[PDB]
């Protein structure tokens, strides 16, 4: 009460920092980029080595791209399935440790400066298949865990649909499921039973391969956790038309009576538009079963990652809808998204989640309110900070605490590449704001700025830590060829980055991110 | 409804920046520091020139120290009164424009590289007195405004008390009001009436001089507003014992039956400030009216106001008045948010800055955040300890005022010069530093680059001055509060400094 003495412990009653507010940093590196002899990175020794190296820097976050099966061009964003793992990430050496292969079966190593997906498939698939076959034919512990995995309801609600879809796709020569014969197209029960009988082996193998992915990924994830590293994933808001996700859940999407999309995704114009062409969600239909499809999707995301970015988060508040009949995106309209009620349903369904909102480009007031109402951080990207004036939200003095700052993403050139093509004027702006030593180390200047931010989380692509140029760019949007291929040079091992590790640690130390 | 079309105006529905969140910057400069011929800066031409210069830089905040009558050492923090203005800031030239003096009456100029208060008083007081006398003897517009000022209830609730207190203090030879004879000490009504009769002239002149201060300060304030400059003031949480504030409001303080403080202020290690303390429960019973009036006066003087030792609203150190050292005290519970609720109901929206430096407790932070008041960061304190130091830029908050230093710190150049090596190498890593000559611009730049919404720089640092321009050194009794802009440096002569500031404000979005 007012005017009275405090207890003797008043002087010691200091403010304690909230542990959920802890400043941190991390590295963006997709596992396909790891070194190794089999044409593609994988979840074996290089993953653990990278985790050790990451830990040694003081970083506590590892961000990956979606771990789904990619398209033939390698893209993790136009995947074949929203919940399955990319089986080409499976490590053959780890299969040997599991007793599912022997050393003499391993293929001769190949040089692959960049990932060629066709080549990695030819090399690895037969062996993964053979391992899966031995797993299914065995009795004993590993087989017993396959069964737990298979009969786990949170797995089976997506895994059986995915396996049947893949069995049918394998059996049929057809562009997409729109062209399937009606009983398969529309999942007649006795058609599905007939598929299980006739493609039983394929289905059991597919399931086995997903188990093996899951097992290897969970080991990487538990090892990260033991080293104090959280794993941050990514998911596109939309899924592709030719997938189990759509085919097994037609009523949750905006399709006509024949299963063809009424409306597809995109954004309006600086252009004639941009037509992505994904089917759109039927959000009122989803509302009627408490958003169960999205709840399951997040449950799988939780299973894979500690935290997850959602690409095109703005779509939850309002989305651009183009007539499927159209060739340009400029003919669409904006539709009302589900807003917070979706996230309420997810919370009741799954508990606490950690979502990052990709909120780049021009966005509307409702996007910002939705993001803030669920407490999700947005993004800042230093590479975008030097156009326009001092109100540019990517400039450090405009950063927020509840935010993730990047030097650049997988969609941007490396900092060195970006610097090299930077327009004079943007460059002189940058020179004033950044602390730049030699232009060779331009990537460290940007890294330092990212770390000096008030944003709680700073993420740096591995390409920038390695100071690489444009040829190490992961993706160039709106190109159909030559993306997703980057690998750590075969020369650079995690034993050979002590200087880089020290330099990062010193910066994290200085800006309070350790 | 979910899935339905938005109106056609969706694409244009962009986020608007909130105007209350606008990033800005300003300069700390007390008006006594202005150049001029009369021994001290004043509210005349130099104030308006400075405002013009400030506007030309892009700054939109001018912070002053308390404008109260100071003690004999010049200190605005151990003032004679919490609500009166320092009459020595009154401009003689502005009195000539008001027709209360003529040019021929103005004194010969004197050299005063620093403010000598005794010298400014000898020079200016007779003229201010004479002006006040002509004002009271006149019958026109100006006289009519004096009367409105005098009879305005929001003025008279402090001004009459202050005038009588000063009249008695002038009439009596006594250390403090504790030694006054009982009827004066305890404000017997017929004693006060006797004072009005016998000191009528002194009282009317005192009131007239406060009117003239008010008039000149309000003109400076309006001129600032017209040039897009808000004025930020300061007030110590506590007032001095020998003041009208205590004497006319005894029940609101922790005094014994004889009017001697039971407990006085300070902080532990000790430091004994020795001010009387508030009787917060007694204040509670008239809805904190004393504090409400105080804030009303602060609103009248400033757009925004810092409160020195804000932590005292949540918990305060209380020393027995008996004592010579502060280490034997105890912590007592402050009024918290209920005070600020009362202020809001009384006065409406306020803009308060919490001085929250040093070691502070969890309740201090919660109170500050619950009323939405910004705290402080001071770059000069940022390089001791580790990376969790709250004064480092990466730990700043938006709702915060960042300083390079305050009036209690050395200039950046002076500070740099005495900085110990481990702290100095730390600074070199965080700051962008060129030559030691421009060390103050390195710190200014860091301040401006902060996420803090408001950045304030002492004029000494803009001028790149050393330790001799330090305004105050705490716990010293002599040589403080004297700094003046060198007579050579005019606001016409700071184009380079203006440009350099504008460029930095432009870059960090504070224009
Ligand atoms: C955000 O999502 C988009 C998907 O629309 C990704 O875009 C990449 O992938 C698509 C599909 O493979 C491709 O057509 C684009 O050219 C490519 O940029 C982004 O990478 C994600 O960050
Ligand atoms: C905060 O308030 C204190 C008052 O306790 C000021 O301290 C200065 O003034 C006092 C009173 O004249 C003097 O004793 C100190 O030595 C001096 O530091 C600060 O200046 C204010 O910021």
Numbering used by the authors:
A (entry chain A): 60 to 328, 332 to 576
B (entry chain B): 60 to 328, 335 to 576
How do the authors describe this structure?
Because only glucose and maltose are exportable to the cytosol, further enzymatic activity is required to prevent the build-up of maltotriose in the chloroplast. AtDPE1 forms a homodimer with a deep, long, and open-ended active site canyon contained within each subunit. The canyon is divided into donor and acceptor sites with the catalytic residues at their junction; a number of loops around the active site adopt different conformations dependent on the occupancy of these sites.
The first of these may be to adopt a catalytically incompetent configuration for the acid/base catalyst (i.e. Glu-420) in the absence of a suitable acceptor, as we observe in all but the ACR-B structure, and thereby preventing it from activating a water molecule and leading to hydrolysis.
